[PDB]
Enzyme design. Structure first.
Site, mmCIF file in Angstrom:
data_model
loop_
_atom_site.group_PDB
_atom_site.id
_atom_site.type_symbol
_atom_site.label_atom_id
_atom_site.label_comp_id
_atom_site.label_asym_id
_atom_site.label_seq_id
_atom_site.Cartn_x
_atom_site.Cartn_y
_atom_site.Cartn_z
ATOM 1 N N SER B 13 -57.170 -19.027 -50.129
ATOM 2 C CA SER B 13 -56.930 -18.199 -48.950
ATOM 3 C C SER B 13 -56.966 -18.945 -47.647
ATOM 4 N N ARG B 20 -50.146 -23.161 -43.335
ATOM 5 C CA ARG B 20 -48.943 -22.469 -42.926
ATOM 6 C C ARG B 20 -48.846 -22.305 -41.428
ATOM 7 N N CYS B 41 -59.033 -15.667 -54.760
ATOM 8 C CA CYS B 41 -58.572 -14.310 -54.514
ATOM 9 C C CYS B 41 -57.438 -13.885 -55.459
ATOM 10 N N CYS B 46 -59.894 -10.988 -55.595
ATOM 11 C CA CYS B 46 -59.347 -9.776 -55.012
ATOM 12 C C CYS B 46 -58.263 -9.101 -55.844
ATOM 13 N N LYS B 49 -59.058 -7.974 -59.636
ATOM 14 C CA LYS B 49 -60.110 -6.965 -59.472
ATOM 15 C C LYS B 49 -59.524 -5.604 -59.075
ATOM 16 N N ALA B 113 -59.090 -33.753 -55.084
ATOM 17 C CA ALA B 113 -59.317 -34.667 -53.970
ATOM 18 C C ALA B 113 -60.785 -35.016 -53.848
ATOM 19 N N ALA B 178 -77.139 -7.521 -58.154
ATOM 20 C CA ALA B 178 -77.114 -6.305 -57.392
ATOM 21 C C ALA B 178 -76.236 -6.343 -56.157
ATOM 22 N N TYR B 180 -72.098 -6.972 -54.359
ATOM 23 C CA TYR B 180 -70.826 -6.282 -54.558
ATOM 24 C C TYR B 180 -70.100 -6.515 -55.917
ATOM 25 N N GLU B 184 -69.135 -3.756 -58.582
ATOM 26 C CA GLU B 184 -67.723 -3.538 -58.892
ATOM 27 C C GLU B 184 -67.480 -3.677 -60.370
ATOM 28 N N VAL B 353 -65.018 -3.695 -47.580
ATOM 29 C CA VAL B 353 -64.876 -2.579 -48.504
ATOM 30 C C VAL B 353 -65.391 -3.077 -49.833
ATOM 31 N N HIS B 450 -56.551 17.091 -39.989
ATOM 32 C CA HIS B 450 -57.058 18.061 -40.936
ATOM 33 C C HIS B 450 -56.005 18.453 -41.965
ATOM 34 N N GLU B 455 -61.435 12.714 -40.723
ATOM 35 C CA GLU B 455 -61.726 13.511 -39.537
ATOM 36 C C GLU B 455 -63.237 13.661 -39.309
HETATM 37 C C1 LIG Z 1 -48.273 26.552 -44.689
HETATM 38 C C2 LIG Z 1 -49.046 25.957 -43.542
HETATM 39 C C3 LIG Z 1 -49.690 24.765 -43.693
HETATM 40 C C4 LIG Z 1 -50.394 24.191 -42.625
HETATM 41 N N1 LIG Z 1 -51.061 23.023 -42.854
HETATM 42 C C5 LIG Z 1 -51.742 22.526 -41.860
HETATM 43 C C6 LIG Z 1 -52.477 21.251 -42.083
HETATM 44 O O1 LIG Z 1 -52.521 20.714 -43.176
HETATM 45 N N2 LIG Z 1 -53.151 20.755 -41.017
HETATM 46 C C7 LIG Z 1 -53.112 21.360 -39.737
HETATM 47 O O2 LIG Z 1 -53.690 20.795 -38.851
HETATM 48 N N3 LIG Z 1 -52.439 22.521 -39.525
HETATM 49 C C8 LIG Z 1 -51.791 23.080 -40.527
HETATM 50 N N4 LIG Z 1 -51.116 24.231 -40.326
HETATM 51 C C9 LIG Z 1 -51.125 24.848 -38.994
HETATM 52 C C10 LIG Z 1 -52.465 25.546 -38.672
HETATM 53 O O3 LIG Z 1 -52.684 26.485 -39.737
HETATM 54 C C11 LIG Z 1 -52.326 26.307 -37.336
HETATM 55 O O4 LIG Z 1 -51.991 25.395 -36.282
HETATM 56 C C12 LIG Z 1 -53.645 26.984 -36.950
HETATM 57 O O5 LIG Z 1 -54.043 27.918 -37.974
HETATM 58 C C13 LIG Z 1 -53.427 27.732 -35.632
HETATM 59 O O6 LIG Z 1 -54.752 28.289 -35.265
HETATM 60 P P1 LIG Z 1 -54.796 29.509 -34.199
HETATM 61 O O7 LIG Z 1 -56.228 29.707 -33.854
HETATM 62 O O8 LIG Z 1 -53.736 29.355 -33.151
HETATM 63 O O9 LIG Z 1 -54.267 30.735 -35.108
HETATM 64 P P2 LIG Z 1 -54.498 31.300 -36.603
HETATM 65 O O10 LIG Z 1 -55.360 30.345 -37.360
HETATM 66 O O11 LIG Z 1 -53.194 31.848 -37.091
HETATM 67 O O12 LIG Z 1 -55.445 32.582 -36.275
HETATM 68 C C14 LIG Z 1 -54.868 33.765 -35.619
HETATM 69 C C15 LIG Z 1 -55.783 34.872 -36.090
HETATM 70 O O13 LIG Z 1 -55.617 36.013 -35.179
HETATM 71 C C16 LIG Z 1 -55.634 37.220 -36.009
HETATM 72 N N5 LIG Z 1 -54.930 38.184 -35.127
HETATM 73 C C17 LIG Z 1 -53.625 38.073 -34.644
HETATM 74 N N6 LIG Z 1 -53.328 39.062 -33.807
HETATM 75 C C18 LIG Z 1 -54.456 39.809 -33.716
HETATM 76 C C19 LIG Z 1 -54.748 41.009 -32.948
HETATM 77 N N7 LIG Z 1 -53.888 41.601 -32.150
HETATM 78 N N8 LIG Z 1 -56.005 41.503 -33.141
HETATM 79 C C20 LIG Z 1 -56.917 40.893 -33.974
HETATM 80 N N9 LIG Z 1 -56.739 39.792 -34.689
HETATM 81 C C21 LIG Z 1 -55.497 39.294 -34.524
HETATM 82 C C22 LIG Z 1 -54.875 36.773 -37.237
HETATM 83 O O14 LIG Z 1 -55.191 37.665 -38.302
HETATM 84 C C23 LIG Z 1 -55.545 35.412 -37.491
HETATM 85 O O15 LIG Z 1 -56.647 35.403 -38.338
HETATM 86 C C24 LIG Z 1 -50.432 24.844 -41.376
HETATM 87 C C25 LIG Z 1 -49.776 26.063 -41.221
HETATM 88 C C26 LIG Z 1 -49.106 26.620 -42.286
HETATM 89 C C27 LIG Z 1 -48.403 27.934 -42.058
HETATM 90 C C1 LIG Z 2 -64.558 -11.431 -58.524
HETATM 91 C C2 LIG Z 2 -64.227 -11.596 -57.064
HETATM 92 C C3 LIG Z 2 -63.676 -10.564 -56.364
HETATM 93 C C4 LIG Z 2 -63.385 -10.699 -54.999
HETATM 94 N N1 LIG Z 2 -62.786 -9.649 -54.367
HETATM 95 C C5 LIG Z 2 -62.488 -9.808 -53.109
HETATM 96 C C6 LIG Z 2 -61.835 -8.676 -52.395
HETATM 97 O O1 LIG Z 2 -61.509 -7.653 -52.970
HETATM 98 N N2 LIG Z 2 -61.566 -8.874 -51.081
HETATM 99 C C7 LIG Z 2 -61.939 -10.053 -50.392
HETATM 100 O O2 LIG Z 2 -61.710 -10.090 -49.215
HETATM 101 N N3 LIG Z 2 -62.538 -11.088 -51.036
HETATM 102 C C8 LIG Z 2 -62.797 -10.980 -52.323
HETATM 103 N N4 LIG Z 2 -63.397 -12.001 -52.971
HETATM 104 C C9 LIG Z 2 -63.739 -13.222 -52.232
HETATM 105 C C10 LIG Z 2 -62.505 -14.100 -51.932
HETATM 106 O O3 LIG Z 2 -61.889 -14.358 -53.204
HETATM 107 C C11 LIG Z 2 -62.975 -15.433 -51.310
HETATM 108 O O4 LIG Z 2 -63.696 -15.181 -50.096
HETATM 109 C C12 LIG Z 2 -61.782 -16.325 -50.956
HETATM 110 O O5 LIG Z 2 -61.010 -16.616 -52.138
HETATM 111 C C13 LIG Z 2 -62.324 -17.629 -50.365
HETATM 112 O O6 LIG Z 2 -61.130 -18.411 -49.961
HETATM 113 P P1 LIG Z 2 -61.304 -20.007 -49.738
HETATM 114 O O7 LIG Z 2 -60.034 -20.483 -49.130
HETATM 115 O O8 LIG Z 2 -62.642 -20.332 -49.146
HETATM 116 O O9 LIG Z 2 -61.420 -20.523 -51.264
HETATM 117 P P2 LIG Z 2 -60.696 -20.240 -52.679
HETATM 118 O O10 LIG Z 2 -59.733 -19.111 -52.519
HETATM 119 O O11 LIG Z 2 -61.735 -20.333 -53.751
HETATM 120 O O12 LIG Z 2 -59.784 -21.583 -52.800
HETATM 121 C C14 LIG Z 2 -60.426 -22.877 -53.073
HETATM 122 C C15 LIG Z 2 -59.316 -23.650 -53.749
HETATM 123 O O13 LIG Z 2 -59.650 -25.079 -53.672
HETATM 124 C C16 LIG Z 2 -59.273 -25.668 -54.959
HETATM 125 N N5 LIG Z 2 -60.124 -26.885 -54.977
HETATM 126 C C17 LIG Z 2 -61.519 -26.928 -54.931
HETATM 127 N N6 LIG Z 2 -61.968 -28.177 -54.874
HETATM 128 C C18 LIG Z 2 -60.859 -28.958 -54.849
HETATM 129 C C19 LIG Z 2 -60.709 -30.403 -54.777
HETATM 130 N N7 LIG Z 2 -61.716 -31.246 -54.713
HETATM 131 N N8 LIG Z 2 -59.415 -30.832 -54.806
HETATM 132 C C20 LIG Z 2 -58.351 -29.960 -54.872
HETATM 133 N N9 LIG Z 2 -58.399 -28.637 -54.919
HETATM 134 C C21 LIG Z 2 -59.672 -28.191 -54.905
HETATM 135 C C22 LIG Z 2 -59.659 -24.579 -55.933
HETATM 136 O O14 LIG Z 2 -58.956 -24.805 -57.152
HETATM 137 C C23 LIG Z 2 -59.067 -23.353 -55.219
HETATM 138 O O15 LIG Z 2 -57.765 -23.000 -55.553
HETATM 139 C C24 LIG Z 2 -63.671 -11.910 -54.336
HETATM 140 C C25 LIG Z 2 -64.232 -12.966 -55.050
HETATM 141 C C26 LIG Z 2 -64.494 -12.821 -56.394
HETATM 142 C C27 LIG Z 2 -65.113 -13.991 -57.114
#
Ligand SMILES: Cc1cc2nc3c(=O)[nH]c(=O)nc-3n(C[C@H](O)[C@H](O)[C@H](O)COP(=O)(O)OP(=O)(O)OC[C@H]3O[C@@H](n4cnc5c(N)ncnc54)[C@H](O)[C@@H]3O)c2cc1C
Ligand SMILES: Cc1cc2nc3c(=O)[nH]c(=O)nc-3n(C[C@H](O)[C@H](O)[C@H](O)COP(=O)(O)OP(=O)(O)OC[C@H]3O[C@@H](n4cnc5c(N)ncnc54)[C@H](O)[C@@H]3O)c2cc1C
Ligand SMILES: NC(=O)C1=CN([C@@H]2O[C@H](COP(=O)(O)OP(=O)(O)OC[C@H]3O[C@@H](n4cnc5c(N)ncnc54)[C@H](OP(=O)(O)O)[C@@H]3O)[C@@H](O)[C@H]2O)C=CC1
Ligand SMILES: NC(=O)C1=CN([C@@H]2O[C@H](COP(=O)(O)OP(=O)(O)OC[C@H]3O[C@@H](n4cnc5c(N)ncnc54)[C@H](OP(=O)(O)O)[C@@H]3O)[C@@H](O)[C@H]2O)C=CC1
Ligand SMILES: N[C@@H](CCC(=O)N[C@@H](CSSC[C@H](NC(=O)CC[C@H](N)C(=O)O)C(=O)NCC(=O)O)C(=O)NCC(=O)O)C(=O)O
Ligand SMILES: N[C@@H](CCC(=O)N[C@@H](CSSC[C@H](NC(=O)CC[C@H](N)C(=O)O)C(=O)NCC(=O)O)C(=O)NCC(=O)O)C(=O)O
Lengths: 461, 461
Positions: B13, B20, B41, B46, B49, B113, B178, B180, B184, B353, B450, B455
């Protein structure tokens, strides 16, 4: 006439959030709710949708079972099993939200509210009057359906509300519309085995998203077995002996229009937009301003044109998301009950996730928007396209696309757009960074997390 | 004696990344590699894994199949299928990295080397000498194993290197350590059906992580069927008629020590640490300083005590991660070939992570570290624990825990710690925010997404 400090019309996302915060601040509040608490998000929106998405996600991953060394998984999805569990979960949430109000000492007035003719803004619910020096309208919206007058038989199709009432998986389904709900529903129905078509008026879905996303999204749908009918619209719908028959006109530019009948359709789903729920509020008795779609007009502080009357959430028709209604509702409570006069929601840089397959995450300006804002000479984008390591061993593939929009010499990050596995959970923290005004240097100076998809955003060149 | 501008010892890495970048800057560079390009890696770290993790993840999700309305998935994982595909993928990467060097005009010197006695720093590889005014040592490290002298029969166990050579799933497996890698490996073996024990010297795993994580992680392991043997260590290992038999001492504090034999063990895996690979470099011929474990000592700019000799990555023994070696290697190239004298890696706020089940993400200070740095009176934490919506419908459960560490009155975010579904892809962007010096206000002022797990971090109270 019972008086309160704060009266909240609607018990959905915005209404609940605002009432709860106001109560913490000492306000004596009441929430009017005519249906179920939790409003759209809980009952027929975010929640039930996500459950169905998780379900469709299961279907997809199960296609990769054999590639991953397991024995092939054989079959038939059972719709009613998951449907019953989804419904129960929603019931659980309804009970929780009711408890949340009670613990806060918020009164719940059950029934439909409407304004009265009374001089001081007053509402009536079931013959009783209620008043407050601050009244929040948060009635949300509803799904839009065509008029039988313009599309005969339109009433034979269902909306996303109807989708959540289905008890069996439809054999053949046609979804009309090209926005997020359309995309999401098509993706769920298709993955679960419905023979699905998505009918769009132009050539791509999500045409308001960054163009890399609308293109990519349209392709991924096709790759996943969704038939995308471009430049097509419904002309009429009719009930045949066995299902529906959809008449559609396909009008590709540079071509003659062609009419096609779609037969044996079990489910026709309209996903064409949402209308605000203001129709039955008697707004005009107070002269509250609405636009021509019925949205309530507000200023940057959520004020209506009438003193002591505010509106938040879907009813205002801007940024129709649960978290937006919540944030605006909360900011409003601080302004009214904590006297923080500068307290308001910034509607820029709101993040969104579209639960497609794979999911989409976006925040900030699209490339075109940045170009219009700063000028072509001042916008630079960075993008990448790759196959997530998950598919290194599968015959089925999906791609991950990411795009970063920067502005000015500093390369301020003004937009992030992506589609790919993991994108739903990846967006949040970059949205924090973007909100803070990060530049490309800030991203670049953050050490990567390997191996992940997320690291790609911090190593763009 | 062939001269270059930059000689890089080790093609892993850090070595690849530094060479480069140096080449892009005009340097005439060569990479010495004795084994396979991509180093630890790619070959045994990485990459392989993550593939195995994705595989184990399949196993888990398949347990939820029936809950999600599908028919039960029946069976036996086939180790060699995935093993063969994993190996091929690694071969693909080896070929890619070789190409990457060639396209950059970097010479690849194959072989081992070692430094020479020569006055000016010079190396020898297979009888030929090479020299450069700048030589990078990036030889990485290796798995640590006990001495037969202290644990008889220790050589009967394998290391993570050996893990990647296994051709069949071990029936019974015991993992010692104990950190990462231990966590994992146990998680992969267990999910794939091995009867797994994890043997740790104290009561929790990941004891250097924030205490909420070590606790939670230890619990999730137990919940997932991993037997955690606390306060236990191996006393001896022996080859019985059918497998290994592990003698262990369990020394719970406040109790008498008890010796236990573990029979019929197929796989004993040592995951006790890593040793730097410097043993055969002939460092002492140049008087290059190492510590007592053999790590090369460097300053903040990766300089060794010898002019024109630098070291990066695992060999230096600090922050043993691929992205750290890459970032340090890159910064070094800019300093040497772009004359950016302030160019160096900041080792604070590096995100990590851990691919456990569910995954762990952490960045910044643990609560204890913040307390020691700022004082108890100046540290405030926020935390949450919840069940991800994914499990709303499953009989199997996992939890999501998150903790935010803030400092001073401003509530600067100095540490983020979490474990839960989605956490592997969620971390990156918050790591950007933390790096930028965000405060709790910055998080709080970011609109939520939402419904997601992410959120939760922006709505902590
Ligand atoms: C299919 C669908 C999917 C959606 N998915 C998302 C999503 O994933 N994420 C997101 O952020 N938004 C989503 N939305 C939009 C979100 O639902 C609306 O922006 C939000 O509900 C608007 O809130 P509000 O308080 O303006 O009105 P509403 O939540 O519609 O509340 C209005 C309320 O006033 C009551 N009411 C109306 N008139 C009267 C009255 N005269 N007297 C008494 N009560 C009354 C109604 O019964 C109701 O409960 C989605 C909407 C739909 C239709
Ligand atoms: C199981 C495991 C999972 C991991 N998962 C993650 C992850 O998900 N995310 C993350 O960010 N990191 C992860 N890591 C860590 C990450 O792999 C290392 O931090 C990273 O590879 C270190 O890069 P480096 O350049 O120091 O060395 P390396 O990538 O180890 O490279 C060293 C290189 O030098 C070469 N070398 C060594 N000595 C010589 C020499 N004398 N002459 C010529 N070549 C030589 C070796 O062959 C090798 O290719 C993980 C590590 C392990 C072991
Ligand atoms: O939810 P949104 O309102 O976000 O989007 C739904 C989308 O469906 C498309 N649409 C709107 N009206 C109709 C209609 N009458 N028939 C078919 N598609 C429609 C539009 O996209 P588009 O403009 O691409 O058709 C619209 O933006
Ligand atoms: O990779 P790392 O070096 O990050 O961690 C491996 C961990 O295994 C434990 N360990 C170290 N030496 C031994 C040993 N000889 N036997 C058993 N466990 C060991 C230590 O944790 P801990 O100190 O908790 O045992 C150590 O931090
Ligand atoms: N997000 C995680 C955990 C799952 C989850 O969110 N579960 C709750 C029901 S979410 S639908 C109702 C919606 N709530 C939100 O949008 C979350 C708001 C956030 N917590 C915040 O504080 O900003 C809503 O209408 N909220 C109104 C309001 O908050 O007043 C859940 O379990 N709720 C029950 C409870 O414990 O109260 C995931 O997606 O996995
Ligand atoms: N991250 C995504 C995409 C999968 C992926 O990363 N695939 C490449 C092999 S990763 S192991 C080798 C490692 N590379 C990295 O750590 C990524 C570095 C990052 N791109 C950056 O620029 O900082 C490494 O040793 N790098 C050394 C180096 O970069 O010089 C892959 O396909 N590589 C082949 C190629 O196209 O070059 C995911 O995890 O899904």
């Amino acid at each position: 006439v019972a008086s309160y400090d704060y009266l909240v019309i609607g018990g959905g996302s915005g209404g609940l959030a605002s009432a709860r915060r106001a109560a913490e601040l000492g306000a004596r509040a009441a929430v009017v709710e005519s249906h179920k608490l939790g409003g759209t998000c809980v009952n027929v929106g975010c929640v039930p949708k996500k459950v169905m998405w998780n379900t469709a996600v299961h279907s997809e991953f199960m296609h990769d079972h054999a590639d991953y060394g397991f024995p092939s998984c054989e079959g038939k999805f059972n719709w009613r099993v998951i449907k019953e569990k989804r419904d129960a979960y929603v019931s659980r949430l309804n009970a929780i939200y009711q408890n949340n109000l009670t613990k806060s000492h918020i009164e719940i007035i059950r029934g439909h509210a409407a304004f009265t003719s009374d001089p001081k803004p007053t509402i009536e619910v079931s013959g009783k009057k209620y008043t407050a020096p601050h009244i929040l309208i948060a009635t949300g919206g509803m799904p839009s359906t065509p008029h039988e007058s313009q599309i005969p038989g339109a009433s034979l199709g269902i909306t996303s509300d109807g989708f959540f009432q289905l008890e069996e998986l439809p054999g053949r389904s046609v979804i009309v519309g090209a926005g997020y709900i359309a995309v999401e529903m098509a993706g769920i129905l298709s993955a679960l085995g419905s023979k699905t078509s998505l009918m769009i008026r132009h050539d791509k879905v999500l045409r308001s998203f960054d163009s890399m996303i609308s293109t990519n999204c349209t392709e991924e749908l096709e790759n996943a077995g969704v038939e995308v009918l471009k430049f097509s619209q419904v002309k009429e719908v009719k009930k045949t002996l066995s299902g529906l028959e959809v008449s559609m006109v396909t009008a590709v530019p540079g071509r003659l229009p062609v009419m096609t009948m779609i037969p044996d359709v079990d489910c026709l789903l309209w996903a064409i937009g949402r209308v605000p729920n203001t129709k039955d509020l008697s707004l005009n008795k107070l002269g509250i301003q609405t636009d021509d779609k019925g949205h309530i007009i507000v200023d940057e502080f959520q004020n209506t044109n009438v003193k002591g009357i505010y509106a938040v959430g879907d009813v205002c028709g801007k940024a129709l998301l649960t978290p937006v209604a919540i944030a605006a509702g909360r900011k409003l409570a601080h302004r009214l009950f904590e006297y923080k006069e500068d307290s308001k929601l910034d509607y820029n840089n709101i993040p969104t996730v579209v639960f497609s397959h794979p999911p989409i995450g976006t925040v900030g300006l699209t490339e075109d928007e940045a170009i219009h804002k700063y000028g072509i000479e001042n916008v630079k984008t960075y993008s990448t396209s790759f196959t997530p390591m998950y598919h290194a061993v599968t015959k089925r593939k999906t791609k991950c696309v990411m795009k970063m929009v920067c502005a000015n010499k500093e390369e301020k990050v003004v937009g992030i757009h992506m589609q790919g596995l993991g994108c739903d959970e990846m967006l949040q923290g970059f949205a924090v960074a973007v909100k803070m005004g990060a530049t490309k240097a800030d991203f670049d100076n953050t050490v990567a997390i390997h191996p992940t998809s997320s690291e790609e955003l911090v190593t763009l060149r």
